[PDB]
Amino acid sequence: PQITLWKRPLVTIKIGGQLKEALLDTGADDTVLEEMNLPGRWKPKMIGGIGGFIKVRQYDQILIEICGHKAIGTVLVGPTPVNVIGRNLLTQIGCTLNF
Amino acid sequence: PQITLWKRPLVTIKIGGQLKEALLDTGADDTVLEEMNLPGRWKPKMIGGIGGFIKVRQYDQILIEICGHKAIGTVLVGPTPVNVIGRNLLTQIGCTLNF
Ligand SMILES: CCOP(=O)(COc1ccc(C[C@H](NC(=O)O[C@H]2CO[C@H]3OCC[C@H]32)[C@H](O)CN(CC(C)C)S(=O)(=O)c2ccc(OC)cc2)cc1)OCC
Fold this sequence. Notes:
2 copies of one chain form a homodimer. By secondary structure, the first copy, chain A, is mainly beta. Chain A has one domain (1-99). In chain A, 4% of the residues lie in helices and 54% in strands. Chain A is built from 1 helix and 9 strands, in the order E-E-E-E-E-E-E-E-H-E. In chain A, strands 2, 3, 4, 5, 6, 7 and 8 form a 7-stranded mixed β-sheet that branches. In chain A, a hairpin with a 2-residue loop joins strand 5 and strand 6 (52-66). Strand 9 of chain A pairs antiparallel with strand 1 (2-3) of chain B, so a sheet runs across the interface. Chains A, B: Residues 20-89 form the Peptidase A2 domain. Chains A, B: The active site is at 25 (for protease activity). Chains A, B: Homodimer, whose active site consists of two apposed aspartic acid residues. Chains A, B: Residues 1-5, 49-55, 88-99 are annotated as: Dimerization of protease.
């Protein structure tokens, strides 16, 4: 689809078999989701945002479907203010900016 | 133009008679720029993201040019680690997400 930006670009995603709402975030390098149960291994990671750094759990090669488009990639799970889909997955679904 | 997201979507902006580099950021409600001593009045504000909140100065009705596209709106100025063009200005330049 083509999404304008008068509202937040929130979409429905499916991860771990569960549906959630997430923000398409071209300013995020990585995909960061609020605390949740996900199956499999994980590694402690640190990531930095506008306000400082937080500790997250890094899940690799995770299946995730964004607005009907499949991705398989790294998902960080931790105390983010909102679920953000970052460029690591936006590229997978063929997302570009246009003006 | 069309901007792919393999790398950060960095563009040149002109604000306050100065050229700077900033990210086209669909996850940013507002526009947040590095410390700059703009003229005129301002109002204190706090904005939060990953890692918490930072203190910024809110300037209204500021002229900004983004890849030759003119806009006018609110800019938040403070110790942000990155300059972001948020949705308040991205809508004015006709920017969409597409996949
Ligand atoms: C202290 C750490 O230092 P750092 O690594 C941080 O460098 C950043 C910070 C913020 C952003 C924009 C946001 N991206 C971000 O956090 O990305 C994370 C996730 O992937 C990583 O890549 C970039 C930093 C990781 C996101 O796009 C916008 N945010 C809101 C979103 C989290 C819901 S925001 O910036 O917190 C914000 C903007 C406008 C607002 O108006 C009210 C409110 C809040 C990009 C790069 O840089 C050193 C020079």
